[PDB]
Amino acid sequence: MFKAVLFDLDGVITDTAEYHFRAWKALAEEIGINGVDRQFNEQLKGVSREDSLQKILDLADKKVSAEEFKELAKRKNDNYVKMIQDVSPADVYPGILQLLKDLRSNKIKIALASASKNGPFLLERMNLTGYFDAIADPAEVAASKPAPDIFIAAAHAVGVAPSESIGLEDSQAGIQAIKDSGALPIGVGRPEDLGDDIVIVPDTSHYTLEFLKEVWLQKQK
Numbered sequence: 340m341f342k343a344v345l346f347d348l349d350g351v352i353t354d355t356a357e358y359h360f361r362a363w364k365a366l367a368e369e370i371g372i373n374g375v376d377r378q379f380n381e382q383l384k385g386v387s388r389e390d391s392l393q394k395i396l397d398l399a400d401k402k403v404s405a406e407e408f409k410e411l412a413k414r415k416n417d418n419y420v421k422m423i424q425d426v427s428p429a430d431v432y433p434g435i436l437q438l439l440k441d442l443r444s445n446k447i448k449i450a451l452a453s454a455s456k457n458g459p460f461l462l463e464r465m466n467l468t469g470y471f472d473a474i475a476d477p478a479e480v481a482a483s484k485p486a487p488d489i490f491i492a493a494a495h496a497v498g499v500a501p502s503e504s505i506g507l508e509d510s511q512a513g514i515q516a517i518k519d520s521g522a523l524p525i526g527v528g529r530p531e532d533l534g535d536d537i538v539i540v541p542d543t544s545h546y547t548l549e550f551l552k553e554v555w556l557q558k559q560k
């Protein structure tokens with residue numbers, strides 16, 4: 340049976356992917372880049388602060404100085420951090436709190452595999468910190484999503500092999516990271532964005548221990 344569930348945070352645990360999108364779009368427009376719309380944003384979900392900024396800057400022909408680059412990333416984060424100050428337990432996505440309780444009752448490890456340095460703060464805002472057996476620090480891995488490092492680290496942090504773990508993600512980059520880690524991915528979002536090669540659910544209410552078991556018993560190979 341699987342022995343661990345590796346949780347992405349933003350867009351899985353709570354609608355915080357929407358906040359990252361709005362913050363990145365605002366930053367981009369401030370520097371005259373209007374290409375960050377929902378479609379383009381799918382390429383930003385799951386990627387690190389610096390990687391997100393560079394993907395946005397790639398839309399421009401000229402480059403910014405190292406000094407401006409650093410200021411831009413900080414500017415976006417300062418805005419994002421203000422945006423999430425009022426997040427509360429009421430903001431936890433449907434099914435997530437129950438899933439955490441069910442996993443603990445069944446002795447299945449719970450680890451956070453978020454690329455966000457604001458992850459710990461958000462779990463505290465939502466009164467979810469106590470459910471996690473481990474939080475993989477995104478600053479410790481040598482390579483961020485789509486690299487599998489963070490999921491491999493989350494699994495190791497709870498003493499479980501990635502091959503015996505399920506990863507929950509809402510992004511293209513994150514799903515790739517799960518795939519290359521050896522864990523089984525179950526994405527949440529629309530088929531047009533995440534693919535038709537893995538199991539995808541339309542919303543988090545589908546993330547029940549019953550369903551994770553249903554899917555796991557159906558894994559290939």
Ligand SMILES: O=P([O-])(O)O[C@@H]1O[C@H](COP(=O)(O)O)[C@@H](O)[C@H](O)[C@H]1O
Nearest residue numbers: 348349359385388453454455456457
């Ligand atoms: O989706 P998950 O939880 O990997 O989290 C990811 O965290 C990145 C870095 O976050 P921060 O700027 O707060 O360090 C964000 O750019 C990305 O949009 C978000 O999906």
Ligand SMILES: [Mg+2]
Nearest residue numbers: 347349350509
């Ligand atoms: Mg996400």
